[PDB]
């Protein structure tokens, strides 16, 4: 049930961006942290990624927990931060992004698990939380329907694609990126993978979920009060969960369609990862401090 | 593993159609049959339906076996016969058709089963076999993939919709009819319902399938040699199955993408129903004799 938070700077661009006050301190693998100072403000996520680090680098860290799902664990990955800061890239960049890398890492792990009596079934769903209203990105009423027993969570009338072939993954993925690149800015996209694997050998029925979330523009209709509502809620929910006496603390899971949606892949034995995508361009140090300040506090 | 065949006349129309040589003999519930003579040729399905009988009438007979799926049984329903003879009506006529009536009858049976500790899960798929090439009517590679163990049968990359709400059934159904009414003539549409219901009480895991098939125009590209290929194959497969020493007889299930597709919901403990939709218009007595002759022989 561990929470981790990583910062993630990206390289400047040609539209805007200059210099850099974003001093990324060297990763201190003793305290296990990794500070960084903006100008001077201090922050220290669970590992920082400067523009130099690539998706592969980023996923090599993550890959670790994401394979837990195959262990029936649940996982949440969040790409938070002002718009244009990279959230969709980190998540869906073709071949590279966390989602593409997850379906792969997971895929490979299974092929190699089959050989161990095991065997897995995989289906997923892609939806989006725009204005607290779930939309089915893979295709009405879509209400989060929980199962207090299995601790599962469905969503009514939501397309759930069987990730059977890589051709599918290809389509879905392709489609997912055409969708979140350049709306996608003012919403929360969510890729959900359901690892359901039996195993004749030990009959160890195993189920687990991964929720790869691309939060909406934390940047500074009235979906605006909304985005700040969800994002802030998530903040409070993560925080509250990453709190010592929290098992006994009252978390407002239902105070937002998102958190409520992933409340099960957010509790008990769950894995949550917050990615604070920030830009190095001094022309965003204002909205950047905010992002680093979101995580910094949320991670306690 | 019983096979039944019903004829099904429909009322004439304004485009064509006159009189009637289609003498429908009275249902003889002793021999259990029901002859009928065309002019004089004799035929005797498992019950005939003249234009007077409605979808409700037709389904009240069928409804019987279709509830078997809830008993883990598998079912196949075929609407065969020259084009314009009613196949799509019998199957998808709004609210009335066999498919709409099945999702209902099944739906009601479950609500009433839940109350008996039971509980069911339902998903379906709608695809079409046009030119031996499976198309996903609910949305690449679609290969029939069998499971010699569970006796199940998937179809790669094929959309499988969770029949969760009646809103969905509504959409799917609506969409299904826009699709097969006035192409749909030169193909085989197939609605597949998967009744998967556990039950905490007796933990009796139960799975069953229903395949509601709208065969292509048996009427008299080169999809033509194809349609005659599939239809004829199905003929031979039904026949061969409805044969005494058939358990020991070699059935060419794979000699057609359709039969091969439903080979499991066609054998062992399966329920197959053939519907020979014919017109009363003397202006089709030629292509009609053929239909009645298809069933007549196939049913032995
Ligand atoms: N890690 C990265 N490496 C290279 N370019 C990046 C990276 N992250 C973001 N970008 C670029 O920044 C721009 C913003 O894209 P996007 O990921 O959608 O940002 P955001 O999701 O924050 O709005 C894109 O042109 C993208 O290619
Ligand atoms: N049982 C029936 N009652 C009333 N009309 C029918 C019936 N069966 C078919 N029809 C009519 O016949 C026409 C042919 O429709 P369709 O069912 O698609 O036939 P087919 O599937 O054989 O091509 C339609 O206009 C339909 O409404
Ligand atoms: Mg974006
Ligand atoms: Mg038709």
């Amino acid at each position: 049930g561990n929470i981790r938070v990583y910062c993630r700077i990206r390289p400047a661009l040609k539209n805007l961006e200059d210099t850099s006050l974003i001093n990324v301190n060297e990763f201190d693998d003793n305290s296990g942290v990794q500070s960084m100072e903006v100008t001077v403000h201090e922050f220290k996520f669970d590992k920082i990624f400067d523009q130099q680090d690539t998706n592969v680098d980023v996923f090599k860290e993550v890959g670790q927990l994401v394979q837990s799902s195959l262990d029936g664990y649940n996982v949440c990955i969040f790409a938070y931060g002002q718009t244009g800061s990279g959230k969709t890239f980190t998540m869906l960049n073709p071949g590279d992004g966390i989602i593409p890398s997850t379906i792969s890492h997971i895929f490979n792990w299974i092929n190699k698990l089959k050989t161990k009596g095991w065997d897995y079934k995989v289906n997923c769903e892609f939806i989006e939380i725009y204005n607290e209203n779930i939309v089915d990105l893979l295709r009405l009423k879509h209400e989060i329907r929980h199962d207090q027993e299995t601790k599962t969570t469905t969503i009514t009338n939501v397309t759930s694609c069987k990730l059977e072939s890589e051709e599918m993954v290809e389509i879905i993925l392709k489609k997912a990126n055409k969708l979140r690149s350049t709306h996608s800015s003012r919403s929360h996209s969510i890729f959900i993978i359901h690892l359901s694997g039996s195993n004749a050998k030990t009959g160890a029925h195993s189920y687990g979920t991964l929720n790869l979330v691309d939060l909406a523009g934390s940047a500074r209709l009235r979906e605006t009060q909304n985005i700040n509502k969800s994002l802030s809620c998530l903040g409070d929910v993560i925080h509250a969960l990453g709190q010592p006496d929290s098992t006994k603390r009252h978390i407002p899971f239902r105070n937002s369609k998102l958190t409520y949606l992933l409340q099960y892949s957010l509790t008990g034995d769950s894995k949550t990862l917050m990615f604070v995508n920030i830009s190095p361009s001094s022309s965003h140090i204002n909205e950047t401090l905010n992002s680093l300040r979101f995580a910094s506090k949320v991670n306690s």
Side-chain angles (χ1 to χ4, degrees), chain A residues 20 41 112 149 188 205 207:
Chain A
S20 252
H41 281 95
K112 103 101 232 123
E149 329 146 9
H188 289 6
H205 298 300
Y207 178 94

Side-chain angles (χ1 to χ4, degrees), chain A residues 1-264:
Chain A
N2 269 315
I3 309 164
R4 268 64 186 131
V5 185
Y6 316 104
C7 181
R8 158 114 224 229
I9 309 90
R10 87 285 192 7
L13 316 160
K14 84 102 160 189
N15 341 79
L16 245 171
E17 310 334 83
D18 188 301
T19 42
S20 252
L21 329 89
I22 306 88
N23 195 36
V24 171
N25 283 348
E26 272 277 318
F27 182 101
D28 200 281
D29 45 315
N30 274 189
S31 45
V33 315
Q34 176 164 11
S35 297
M36 74 163 278
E37 345 138 2
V38 194
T39 316
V40 148
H41 281 95
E42 223 217 326
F43 312 95
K44 73 189 250 137
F45 310 75
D46 275 275
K47 163 149 227 29
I48 304 191
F49 297 137
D50 206 308
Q51 60 231 279
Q52 354 122 356
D53 300 308
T54 112
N55 275 13
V56 176
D57 275 319
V58 155
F59 178 89
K60 268 161 148 191
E61 241 287 39
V62 152
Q64 182 61 108
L65 116 164
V66 245
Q67 45 184 353
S68 308
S69 357
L70 283 129
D71 286 331
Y73 272 65
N74 291 325
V75 176
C76 279
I77 321 268
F78 295 99
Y80 168 82
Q82 134 197 252
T83 295
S85 84
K87 326 192 280 296
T88 319
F89 182 101
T90 308
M91 232 82 212
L92 250 143
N93 190 59
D96 245 332
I98 304 233
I99 303 173
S101 318
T102 306
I103 290 159
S104 259
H105 179 63
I106 263 161
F107 267 177
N108 305 329
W109 248 117
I110 293 164
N111 282 312
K112 103 101 232 123
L113 259 139
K114 153 202 102 257
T115 81
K116 256 188 46 107
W118 277 96
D119 142 36
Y120 283 55
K121 223 240 92 181
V122 162
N123 54 118
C124 79
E125 298 97 26
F126 193 40
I127 38 133
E128 99 138 335
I129 298 192
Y130 171 42
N131 268 332
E132 294 297 292
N133 274 106
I134 278 165
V135 193
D136 185 351
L137 294 163
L138 292 175
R139 86 134 225 86
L140 233 195
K141 272 142 84 212
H142 305 312
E143 342 141 27
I144 296 141
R145 294 262 274 271
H146 293 289
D147 180 314
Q148 292 73 12
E149 329 146 9
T150 60
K151 248 84 154 300
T152 56
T153 292
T154 321
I155 290 149
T156 72
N157 309 300
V158 148
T159 317
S160 185
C161 282
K162 234 169 130 177
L163 289 176
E164 267 179 332
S165 73
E166 270 273 351
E167 354 311 341
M168 184 68 271
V169 176
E170 240 269 280
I171 281 92
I172 285 165
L173 261 334
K174 205 191 218 104
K175 191 130 218 248
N177 209 71
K178 286 235 108 179
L179 292 156
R180 326 273 319 169
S181 265
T182 310
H183 188 355
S184 22
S185 168
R186 299 290 105 204
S187 18
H188 289 6
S189 68
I190 300 106
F191 203 104
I192 322 167
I193 309 112
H194 305 278
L195 305 181
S196 191
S198 97
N199 140 65
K201 265 78 168 210
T202 318
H205 298 300
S206 192
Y207 178 94
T209 274
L210 294 111
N211 316 109
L212 317 179
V213 192
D214 187 357
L215 303 188
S218 128
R220 249 198 58 166
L221 232 143
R222 214 12 85 103
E223 68 208 356
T224 316
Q225 170 124 46
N226 234 15
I227 292 158
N228 269 243
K229 194 231 147 135
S230 230
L231 289 168
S232 180
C233 176
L234 174 85
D236 323 294
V237 183
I238 296 295
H239 159 69
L241 268 178
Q243 257 10 263
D245 185 295
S246 65
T247 158
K248 358 243 281 259
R249 130 101 18 192
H250 296 117
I251 316 183
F253 287 95
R254 20 163 47 76
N255 284 14
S256 196
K257 220 107 143 80
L258 169 64
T259 45
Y260 181 59
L261 203 214
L262 339 152
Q263 78 175 185
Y264 269 145

Side-chain angles (χ1 to χ4, degrees), chain A residues 281-296:
Chain A
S281 165
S282 45
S283 74
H284 292 141
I285 306 304
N286 264 179
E287 199 352 75
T288 286
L289 307 145
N290 293 339
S291 292
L292 317 167
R293 261 195 245 97
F294 160 104
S296 51

